Amino acid sequence: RDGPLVLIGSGLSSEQQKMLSELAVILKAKKYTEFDSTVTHVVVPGDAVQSTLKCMLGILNGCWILKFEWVKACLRRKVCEQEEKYEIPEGPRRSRLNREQLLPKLFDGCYFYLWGTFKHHPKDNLIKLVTAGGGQILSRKPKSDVTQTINTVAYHARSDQRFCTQYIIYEDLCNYRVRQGKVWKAPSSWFIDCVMSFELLPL
């Protein structure tokens, strides 16, 4: 049997947030305001999925990512309603079936060096996401000592990305030869897009 649900809201209204907490006590579960691996459900306000850290952490966690009409229906009925109808399609579903099937994490076998400055999605956010996605953080800019001898494969790679698993992530002007050796150059937008689609996208 399942543990009690652990819910969280992302980009929710103030009313929607009151409504959500009213469900938690009714469904006899916790509601959180900060994301944790124990979170079962992430509720978004609309239908589009949000590029917030919580929604992203939830996708990598294989959580239900559901429209707010789910909470409405739950309060309306005072039951846990079945989630699929409210699930946000594409990446979140993909990720949840990956979790349910015990398949490896999105960035499994991959390594990431975060180069330069990050405004849009800060650096600490990126670190959290590489770690939540089963990826590893390179503390040094990859050149050719450890670089060739890294011999992992990436499950979610289609592709040279299967076995060239190291990434220099940038936001700033990075002129270039997208791959040199086992190391790719990729903008953070590519990384974010991977997470939102639950996909190791081609470069």
Short mmCIF file of C-alpha atoms in Angstrom, two decimals:
data_model
loop_
_atom_site.label_atom_id
_atom_site.label_comp_id
_atom_site.label_asym_id
_atom_site.label_seq_id
_atom_site.Cartn_x
_atom_site.Cartn_y
_atom_site.Cartn_z
CA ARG A 1 0.00 0.00 0.00
CA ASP A 2 1.05 3.61 -0.59
CA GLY A 3 2.22 5.94 2.15
CA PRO A 4 0.12 9.01 2.80
CA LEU A 5 0.35 11.59 0.01
CA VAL A 6 2.77 14.53 0.29
CA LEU A 7 1.55 17.48 -1.78
CA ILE A 8 3.12 20.77 -2.90
CA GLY A 9 2.02 23.75 -5.04
CA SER A 10 3.99 25.66 -7.69
CA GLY A 11 2.97 29.12 -8.93
CA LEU A 12 -0.32 28.72 -7.06
CA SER A 13 -2.69 31.49 -6.00
CA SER A 14 -3.18 32.39 -2.33
CA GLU A 15 -6.70 30.89 -2.45
CA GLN A 16 -5.42 27.87 -4.38
CA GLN A 17 -2.80 27.42 -1.64
CA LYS A 18 -5.48 27.59 1.11
CA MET A 19 -7.59 25.15 -0.95
CA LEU A 20 -4.58 22.79 -1.28
CA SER A 21 -3.86 22.69 2.47
CA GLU A 22 -7.59 22.08 3.08
CA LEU A 23 -7.25 18.92 0.96
CA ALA A 24 -4.19 17.65 2.89
CA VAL A 25 -5.92 17.47 6.30
CA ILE A 26 -9.04 16.09 4.51
CA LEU A 27 -6.98 13.41 2.71
CA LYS A 28 -4.91 12.94 5.90
CA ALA A 29 -1.51 13.82 4.45
CA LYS A 30 1.21 16.47 4.71
CA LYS A 31 1.46 19.56 2.53
CA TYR A 32 4.85 21.15 1.95
CA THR A 33 5.99 24.61 0.83
CA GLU A 34 9.55 23.49 -0.03
CA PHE A 35 10.28 20.48 -2.27
CA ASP A 36 11.54 17.17 -0.94
CA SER A 37 12.10 13.70 -2.38
CA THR A 38 9.07 12.58 -0.26
CA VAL A 39 6.70 14.84 -2.29
CA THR A 40 4.19 12.66 -4.16
CA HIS A 41 2.20 15.41 -5.93
CA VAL A 42 3.08 18.79 -7.38
CA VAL A 43 0.06 20.92 -8.29
CA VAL A 44 0.36 23.65 -10.94
CA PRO A 45 -2.22 26.41 -11.45
CA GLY A 46 -3.00 25.98 -15.15
CA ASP A 47 -2.31 23.19 -17.66
CA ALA A 48 1.11 24.10 -19.01
CA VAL A 49 3.92 22.83 -16.78
CA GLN A 50 6.03 25.48 -15.07
CA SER A 51 9.78 25.94 -15.30
CA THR A 52 10.01 26.47 -11.53
CA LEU A 53 12.51 24.51 -9.44
CA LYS A 54 9.69 22.62 -7.70
CA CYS A 55 8.03 21.52 -10.96
CA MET A 56 11.44 20.52 -12.31
CA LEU A 57 12.49 18.73 -9.11
CA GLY A 58 9.10 16.97 -9.23
CA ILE A 59 9.60 15.75 -12.79
CA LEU A 60 13.03 14.36 -11.95
CA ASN A 61 11.43 12.77 -8.89
CA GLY A 62 8.73 11.07 -11.00
CA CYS A 63 5.93 12.84 -9.12
CA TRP A 64 2.40 13.44 -10.27
CA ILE A 65 2.43 16.89 -11.83
CA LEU A 66 -1.27 17.85 -11.97
CA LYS A 67 -3.60 20.74 -12.94
CA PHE A 68 -5.43 22.53 -10.11
CA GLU A 69 -8.73 21.06 -11.32
CA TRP A 70 -7.47 17.88 -9.54
CA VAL A 71 -7.61 19.56 -6.12
CA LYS A 72 -11.02 21.01 -6.98
CA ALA A 73 -12.32 17.53 -7.81
CA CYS A 74 -10.81 16.09 -4.60
CA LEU A 75 -12.48 18.75 -2.38
CA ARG A 76 -15.68 18.45 -4.40
CA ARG A 77 -15.75 14.72 -3.57
CA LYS A 78 -13.66 14.50 -0.34
CA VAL A 79 -11.75 11.58 -1.85
CA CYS A 80 -8.41 11.13 -3.39
CA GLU A 81 -9.42 11.37 -7.08
CA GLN A 82 -7.53 9.32 -9.69
CA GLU A 83 -4.64 11.45 -11.02
CA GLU A 84 -4.23 10.54 -14.72
CA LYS A 85 -7.01 12.87 -15.94
CA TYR A 86 -5.25 15.85 -14.35
CA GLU A 87 -1.66 14.78 -15.08
CA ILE A 88 0.35 17.21 -17.15
CA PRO A 89 1.26 15.36 -20.33
CA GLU A 90 4.65 14.69 -21.92
CA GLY A 91 7.73 14.90 -19.66
CA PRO A 92 5.98 14.49 -16.25
CA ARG A 93 4.09 11.41 -17.42
CA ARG A 94 7.21 10.07 -19.18
CA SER A 95 9.18 10.64 -16.01
CA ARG A 96 6.53 8.99 -13.77
CA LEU A 97 6.39 5.81 -15.91
CA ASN A 98 10.23 5.80 -15.82
CA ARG A 99 10.04 5.96 -12.05
CA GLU A 100 7.28 3.30 -11.87
CA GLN A 101 9.28 1.01 -14.16
CA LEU A 102 12.38 1.51 -11.96
CA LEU A 103 14.33 2.70 -14.98
CA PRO A 104 17.51 4.79 -14.45
CA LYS A 105 17.46 8.55 -13.76
CA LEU A 106 17.35 11.08 -16.63
CA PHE A 107 21.03 12.15 -16.51
CA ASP A 108 22.38 8.79 -15.39
CA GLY A 109 25.92 8.28 -16.64
CA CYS A 110 26.30 11.99 -17.48
CA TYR A 111 28.63 14.67 -16.09
CA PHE A 112 28.19 18.47 -16.09
CA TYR A 113 30.56 21.42 -15.74
CA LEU A 114 28.68 24.67 -15.16
CA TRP A 115 30.72 27.41 -16.90
CA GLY A 116 30.37 31.15 -16.24
CA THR A 117 27.48 33.20 -14.86
CA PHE A 118 23.81 32.21 -14.58
CA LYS A 119 20.86 34.60 -14.13
CA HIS A 120 17.77 32.99 -15.70
CA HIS A 121 18.09 29.76 -13.75
CA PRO A 122 20.75 30.29 -11.07
CA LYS A 123 23.76 28.03 -10.64
CA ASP A 124 22.71 26.41 -7.34
CA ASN A 125 19.40 25.53 -9.04
CA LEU A 126 21.30 23.84 -11.88
CA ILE A 127 23.45 21.88 -9.38
CA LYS A 128 20.27 20.69 -7.59
CA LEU A 129 18.82 19.56 -10.94
CA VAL A 130 21.95 17.67 -12.10
CA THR A 131 21.96 15.88 -8.72
CA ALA A 132 18.17 15.22 -8.72
CA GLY A 133 18.51 13.87 -12.27
CA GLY A 134 21.15 11.27 -11.30
CA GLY A 135 23.92 13.24 -13.04
CA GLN A 136 27.29 14.27 -11.64
CA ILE A 137 28.93 17.65 -11.23
CA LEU A 138 32.41 18.16 -12.57
CA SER A 139 34.36 20.54 -10.31
CA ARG A 140 36.95 21.15 -13.07
CA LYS A 141 36.59 22.30 -16.68
CA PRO A 142 37.07 19.13 -18.81
CA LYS A 143 39.97 19.41 -21.26
CA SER A 144 41.87 14.85 -21.04
CA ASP A 145 43.24 13.00 -17.99
CA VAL A 146 40.02 11.85 -16.32
CA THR A 147 38.11 12.92 -19.46
CA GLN A 148 38.95 10.01 -21.83
CA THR A 149 38.91 7.40 -19.00
CA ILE A 150 35.26 8.18 -18.05
CA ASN A 151 33.51 5.21 -19.65
CA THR A 152 29.85 5.36 -18.62
CA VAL A 153 26.90 5.16 -20.97
CA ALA A 154 23.81 7.36 -20.67
CA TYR A 155 20.59 5.30 -20.64
CA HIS A 156 18.44 8.10 -22.02
CA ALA A 157 20.77 8.89 -24.91
CA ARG A 158 19.34 7.91 -28.28
CA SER A 159 23.83 8.73 -30.82
CA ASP A 160 27.31 9.84 -29.66
CA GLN A 161 25.58 11.05 -26.50
CA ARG A 162 25.40 7.39 -25.49
CA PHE A 163 29.12 7.34 -24.69
CA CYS A 164 30.23 10.97 -24.83
CA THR A 165 28.54 11.87 -21.58
CA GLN A 166 30.36 15.03 -20.39
CA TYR A 167 28.80 18.50 -20.67
CA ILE A 168 30.05 22.05 -20.39
CA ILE A 169 26.91 24.03 -19.60
CA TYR A 170 26.83 27.75 -20.33
CA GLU A 171 24.50 30.73 -20.38
CA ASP A 172 26.98 33.39 -21.54
CA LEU A 173 28.34 33.85 -25.04
CA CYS A 174 30.03 30.54 -25.87
CA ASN A 175 31.28 30.73 -29.48
CA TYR A 176 32.28 27.57 -31.40
CA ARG A 177 32.90 21.77 -32.78
CA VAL A 178 29.88 21.36 -30.47
CA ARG A 179 31.64 18.24 -29.24
CA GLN A 180 35.36 17.84 -28.63
CA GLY A 181 36.28 14.34 -27.47
CA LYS A 182 33.70 13.14 -24.94
CA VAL A 183 32.71 16.69 -23.94
CA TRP A 184 29.77 18.64 -25.40
CA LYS A 185 29.09 22.36 -25.16
CA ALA A 186 25.41 22.99 -24.37
CA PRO A 187 23.42 26.02 -23.35
CA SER A 188 21.45 25.85 -20.09
CA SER A 189 18.26 26.17 -22.19
CA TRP A 190 19.09 22.73 -23.65
CA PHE A 191 19.55 21.37 -20.09
CA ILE A 192 16.30 22.92 -18.87
CA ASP A 193 14.50 21.59 -21.97
CA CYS A 194 15.84 18.11 -21.22
CA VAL A 195 14.32 18.26 -17.76
CA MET A 196 10.95 19.65 -18.96
CA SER A 197 10.63 17.00 -21.71
CA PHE A 198 12.26 14.27 -19.55
CA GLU A 199 14.57 13.66 -22.43
CA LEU A 200 18.29 13.69 -23.10
CA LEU A 201 17.84 15.86 -26.21
CA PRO A 202 20.19 15.81 -29.18
CA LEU A 203 22.84 18.51 -29.68
#
